[PDB]
Structure formats: structure tokens, C-alpha cells
Amino acid sequence: IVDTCSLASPASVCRTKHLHLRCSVDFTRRTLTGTAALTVQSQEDNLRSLVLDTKDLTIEKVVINGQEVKYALGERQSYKGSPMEISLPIALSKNQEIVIEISFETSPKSSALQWLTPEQTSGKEHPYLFSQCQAIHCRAILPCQDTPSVKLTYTAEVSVPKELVALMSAIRDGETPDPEDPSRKIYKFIQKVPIPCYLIALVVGALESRQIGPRTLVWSEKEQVEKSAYEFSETESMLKIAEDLGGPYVWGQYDLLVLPPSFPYGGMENPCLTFVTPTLLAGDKSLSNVIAHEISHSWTGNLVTNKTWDHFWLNEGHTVYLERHICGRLFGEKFRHFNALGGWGELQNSVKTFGETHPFTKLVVDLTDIDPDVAYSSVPYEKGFALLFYLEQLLGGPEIFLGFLKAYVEKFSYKSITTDDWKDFLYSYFKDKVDVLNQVDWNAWLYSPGLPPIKPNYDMTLTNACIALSQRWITAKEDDLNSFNATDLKDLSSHQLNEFLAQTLQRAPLPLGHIKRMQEVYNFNAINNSEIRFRWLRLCIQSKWEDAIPLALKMATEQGRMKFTRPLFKDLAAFDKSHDQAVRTYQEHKASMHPVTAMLVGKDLKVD
Numbered sequence: 191i192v193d194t195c196s197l198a199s200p201a202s203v204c205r206t207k208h209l210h211l212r213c214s215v216d217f218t219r220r221t222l223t224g225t226a227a228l229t230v231q232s233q234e235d236n237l238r239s240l241v242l243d244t245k246d247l248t249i250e251k252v253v254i255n256g257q258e259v260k261y262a263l264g265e266r267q268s269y270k271g272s273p274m275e276i277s278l279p280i281a282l283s284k285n286q287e288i289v290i291e292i293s294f295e296t297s298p299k300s301s302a303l304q305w306l307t308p309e310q311t312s313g314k315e316h317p318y319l320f321s322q323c324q325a326i327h328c329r330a331i332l333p334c335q336d337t338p339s340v341k342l343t344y345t346a347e348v349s350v351p352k353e354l355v356a357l358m359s360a361i362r363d364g365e366t367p368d369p370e371d372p373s374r375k376i377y378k379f380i381q382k383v384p385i386p387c388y389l390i391a392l393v394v395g396a397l398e399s400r401q402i403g404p405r406t407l408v409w410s411e412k413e414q415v416e417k418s419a420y421e422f423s424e425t426e427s428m429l430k431i432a433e434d435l436g437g438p439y440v441w442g443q444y445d446l447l448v449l450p451p452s453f454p455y456g457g458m459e460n461p462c463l464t465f466v467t468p469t470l471l472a473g474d475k476s477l478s479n480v481i482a483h484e485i486s487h488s489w490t491g492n493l494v495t496n497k498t499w500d501h502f503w504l505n506e507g508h509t510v511y512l513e514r515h516i517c518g519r520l521f522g523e524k525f526r527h528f529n530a531l532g533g534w535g536e537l538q539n540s541v542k543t544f545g546e547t548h549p550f551t552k553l554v555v556d557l558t559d560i561d562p563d564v565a566y567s568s569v570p571y572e573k574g575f576a577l578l579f580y581l582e583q584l585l586g587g588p589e590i591f592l593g594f595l596k597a598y599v600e601k602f603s604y605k606s607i608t609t610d611d612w613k614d615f616l617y618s619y620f621k622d623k624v625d626v627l628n629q630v631d632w633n634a635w636l637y638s639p640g641l642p643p644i645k646p647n648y649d650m651t652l653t654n655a656c657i658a659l660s661q662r663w664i665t666a667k668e669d670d671l672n673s674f675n676a677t678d679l680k681d682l683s684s685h686q687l688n689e690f691l692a693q694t695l696q697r698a699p700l701p702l703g704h705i706k707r708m709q710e711v712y713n714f715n716a717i718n719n720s721e722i723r724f725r726w727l728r729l730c731i732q733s734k735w736e737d738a739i740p741l742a743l744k745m746a747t748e749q750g751r752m753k754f755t756r757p758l759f760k761d762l763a764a765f766d767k768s769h770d771q772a773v774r775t776y777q778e779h780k781a782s783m784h785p786v787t788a789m790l791v792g793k794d795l796k797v798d
């Protein structure tokens with residue numbers, strides 16, 4: 191009903207229908223300049239003004255029907271930005287529309303953008319720009335109702351230096367030389383499917399593409415295009431599986447974009463162009479589960495969207511569920527349970543890090559006066575998945591629940607819903623099983639902190655080997671280390687190898703002699719898998735092995751994935767032999783880190 195993260199007019203007052211973006215990317219000044227034409231529809235009678243979200247934006251003028259109108263910026267409200275009130279030249283009746291062209295310019299401190307210098311890229315000769323609007327950063331790029339309760343289509347014309355390429359979360363609609371400047375190109379984009387504004391994405395740089403499917407192009411710098419094309423070859427197979435689970439894919443194109451290492455997330459479900467971290471380039475497709483996850487957002491998240499960020503679990507919860515069904519269809523049901531059981535372990539970590547009582551461990555959170563970037567964690571992913579997984583086992587198994595999910599996506603397609611909307615449809619769909627649903631502790635699952643009230647049933651086939659080897663190392667004495675050998679891993683996949691470290695890491699610290707012996711027989715230092723290397727180094731740093739200090743500092747700074755960089759920095763700061771280096775390394779790299787990551791890493795290290 192009320193979006194406590196937005197200062198703009200609610201959807202009950204007016205709602206944006208379309209956005210026409212005409213801007214120019216200036217790497218000299220690190221700014222976006224142009225006009226944002228918002229087609230606004232009134233939701234009440236005698237509407238004479240509205241408020242929009244902005245964050246560090248410069249408003250030159252606001253034109254309506256070819257005339258300038260009066261506008262005013264309120265005082266800034268911290269992360270929410272500054273509200274922008276506009277005086278309409280006419281009063282609108284209900285359902286009447288008007289087009290508001292706003293001339294704007296971004297600040298180099300835009301929390302949605304990161305500007306890279308040539309030395310920060312692979313080619314080393316051209317700059318790079320990419321955007322991250324989710325959750326409420328789009329207001330830092332252009333004025334808008336920065337709330338997932340409004341969905342709009344958009345067309346865009348972006349001007350960039352001719353030697354560079356621009357891509358957006360839309361269907362490419364041609365390129366032509368800038369008629370005003372021979373040194374620039376203009377790339378045209380159109381997104382015919384209405385989306386919440388947080389799915390607005392832009393990227394500019396020396397980008398090349400490689401076709402890996404009938405509807406998928408992999409984009410990155412020349413140095414990673416081929417490496418990326420192989421890593422994500424399963425994309426089309428996952429799109430077909432996703433189509434079988436959630437219905438037709440309605441976005442036309444599904445391209446991939448591998449960004450520089452400073453990308454904060456593993457992936458971003460930007461429509462038509464998923465952004466992914468280069469840390470997925472393991473060389474064996476072992477991390478392609480993130481691709482399945484991002485593909486699933488084409489239904490759960492982008493089609494059926496959370497009305498507010500309090501109900502973020504709807505987006506991620508069902509997305510993880512779809513993702514793990516896609517991997518199950520590709521590698522077997524036992525693999526689905528293996529990952530499901532592993533996700534429960536991550537949920538254990540998040541609750542133990544926040545605390546059994548922390549409000550952020552609730553499935554549905556109250557973000558009033560809370561920066562979404564500060565509450566973001568695995569809770570909505572795993573606790574949300576555990577609920578759906580719990581409901582699957584409670585209502586008749588995966589076949590039955592997938593039927594509900596497909597009907598759920600068709601029921602709320604192109605719309606924004608709340609948790610109660612989802613709960614109601616669950617009761618409507620399973621009307622013949624309300625007696626089973628009433629046995630569910632909806633208050634504990636949806637609004638209670640800590641671990642869920644009940645744990646689902648997990649198959650242990652693929653996990654036992656991990657627990658076996660993990661228990662050996664934890665209980666091992668000094669005269670037992672000699673019996674460990676590289677042969678211990680001959681039948682363990684990369685995922686089992688990663689889960690073994692996760693289980694072992696839960697009982698850290700280990701004796702310093704155990705860690706040294708582990709590297710001697712297992713040689714984990716030589717593994718480039720970011721997931722495995724991340725946990726191996728955490729085990730080392732937490733076990734007080736000084737040799738691992740430079741390794742952890744290098745991984746924590748040579749890439750910017752918050753999943754890895756934040757825990758690495760925290761672990762290094764808690765190690766007395768590396769505390770000073772950790773704070774120093776952050777301070778020297780702070781200026782060139784991603785704006786969101788730099789803020790969170792500063793708070794984690796208590797240097798803010």
C-alpha cells in the first residue's frame with residue numbers, strides 16, 4: 191500500500207506509463223545529460239501536481255506542452271534522495287495523461303553508476319560505465335517514481351563516443367552517427383514490456399558480442415568474450431526449461447553481459463540483458479546456476495514484481511525455487527536437493543551473522559527508514575526458498591507445486607503484488623487443501639526472525655561425502671593429518687568440494703597445522719573457482735594463517751563482488767596480523783570501488 195522507500199507520488203495518485211530517454215554519456219565529466227519524458231496518468235480528479243524521486247540530480251527545466259512549468263526540490267532525505275514537486279499547467283481528471291519532459295544531469299557521485307578509467311578495464315584503452323538501479327538507485331540516474339509498484343515501457347536514445355558501444359535493458363533499435371557531433375554514436379533502444387524502473391539498465395564501453403543461442407548474445411570486452419561464450423553455453427537449454435516451468439518468455443531477446451570485476455552482484459536480472467560478474471568464469475560451467483537464477487527472474491521478479499521492497503522475498507524466493515528446478519532438470523533431482531540443502535546452510539550463516547532476533551532475518555521486512563542496501567542478505571533467498579520448498583513437500587511434491595507456480599506467474603503477470611496477494615492465491619489454488627495450509631505457522635514463516643520454525647526434508651546422497659570428509663578434518667588429531675591425501679577428492683565434484691569447505695568453515699578456526707596440511711595435500715591455492723577460493727581463504731584467514739593474508743587481500747580487491755569482498759574484508763579486519771592492512775587496503779582502493787560496495791565495506795570495517 192505504502193512504499194516507505196519512495197518519496198514520490200504513490201500509484202494511487204498517478205502512475206508513469208512510458209519513459210522516453212534522450213541522454214549523452216560524457217566520460218570527461220562523468221555525467222549523464224539529457225531529457226526524461228515521462229508519460230504520467232492521473233489516478234484521481236483535479237490533479238494539479240505530483241512528486242518524483244531524485245538523488246543528486248540537477249534539474250535544468252521541466253517542459254509540458256512546450257512550456258516551462260514550476261518545480262521545487264525538497265530537502266534531501268539521506269539515501270532516499272530529494273523529492274521533486276512539479277506544478278502541472280492543467281488539472282487532470284482520472285485516467286487523463288500528460289507528458290513531462292524533464293531536463294536533468296547526473297552527479298559523478300550517482301549511486302546507480304560506476305565510472306571506470308581505461309586502467310580499470312581489460313583493454314586498457316577506453317573508459318567503461320555500467321549502472322545498478324536495484325533497489326532504489328534509478329532515482330540517481332533520472333527523475334522517476336522510484337518504486338516497484340509502477341511499471342512503464344521506455345524507449346531510449348543514448349549518445350556515446352563513436353568508438354564505444356551502449357547497451358540497455360531493452361531491444362536494440364538501431365544505431366546512427368550523432369548528427370550534432372561526428373565524434374559520437376547514438377544507440378536506440380525500446381522496451382515494449384512494462385517494467386518497474388529499477389530494471390532500467392545502461393552500459394557503455396568497448397564491448398564485443400558472440401552469439402551462443404537463437405536469442406542470446408554474450409557481451410564483454412574482447413579479452414573475455416570467448417571465455418564468457420563457453421562459460422554460459424547452457425543458456426538456451428535453461429531458457430527452454432524455464433519456459434516449460436513458467437510459460438512463454440515474453441522479452442524477445444535474452445543477452446548476457448559480463449562486467450568488470452567491480453560489479454557488486456553475481457547477476458542482475460535486467461530485462462533483455464542480464465549483467466553477470468566475471469567471477470563466474472570458472473572455466474567449466476560449474477557456476478552457471480547464477481545464469482539459471484537470472485533467467486528465472488524473467489518470470490518471478492520482472493513479470494510478477496514485488497509491490498514494495500518489504501516483499502522482496504517474492505522476487506528472490508520463487509526465483510531460487512525456479513533456478514534449482516532448472517538445475518534439477520539438467521542434473522537430476524538429487525542435485526536439486528544438494529543445492530537446496532546447501533542453501534539451508536547459507537541461511538544458517540546469515541541468521542548467525544545477524545542474530546536470531548535481528549529484524550532483517552524476517553521473510554517480510556519493514557524497511558521504513560532503512561537503506562535497502564544495508565538490509566540486503568541471503569535471508570529472502572534461502573528463507574524464501576525454504577518456505578516454497580516446505581510448501582512443495584507439504585502439498586504433494588514438486589510436480590504439484592510447479593503447477594501452482596505456473597498459474598501464479600500467469601495470474602499476476604505484468605503486475606506488482608504483495609505477500610498477501612501471494613498468500614490468497616495460494617489458498618485459492620490449493621482450495622482443496624486449506625486444512626493443510628492452515629497447519630502452516632504463517633506468522634513465524636513470514637514475520638518472525640531467525641531460522642524458520644521447521645526444516646524441510648533433504649536428500650543426503652550428494653552431501654554425505656562432504657560431511658564425511660569435513661568431520662574427519664574437524665576431529666583429526668596431529669598424528670591423523672598424515673593419512674589425508676589428494677585421493678580424498680577424486681570422486682568429489684566442484685560443488686561437493688565447495689560444500690566441504692563450507693561445512694568445515696562453520697567449525698573454524700581449525701588448528702594452524704591442519705590448514706597447512708590441507709594446502710599440502712589438496713593445494714586449494716591453485717583453484718581459481720571464485721566460490722571455492724573464497725571459502726578456502728576465509729578458512730585460512732579465520733584459522734590465523736599469515737601466508738593467506740596477501741591472497742585474501744588480492745581477491746578482496748581484484749574483484750568487487752560483495753558476496754566475496756565483504757566477508758573477506760571482515761575476516762581480514764578480525765585477524766590481528768592483518769587488521770591494519772585491511773583498513774589501509776580499503777582506504778587506498780575506496781576511491782575506485784563501486785559506490786555501493788565502498789559504503790558497505792566502510793560500515794563493515796567501522797571506518798565510516
Ligand SMILES: O=C(CCC(=O)N1CCC[C@H]1C(=O)O)[C@@H]1CCCN1
Nearest residue numbers: 324455456457458459506568751753
Ligand atoms: O537474484 C539477484 C542476484 C543474485 C546475487 O548475485 N546474489 C544474491 C545473493 C548473493 C549474491 C551474489 O551472488 O553475489 C538479484 C541480485 C541482487 C538483487 N537482485
Ligand SMILES: COc1ccc(Cc2ccccc2)cc1
Nearest residue numbers: 324325499502562563565566567
Ligand atoms: C540488491 O537489491 C536489493 C533489493 C531489495 C532490498 C530490500 C530487502 C533486503 C533484504 C530483505 C528484504 C528486502 C535491498 C537490496
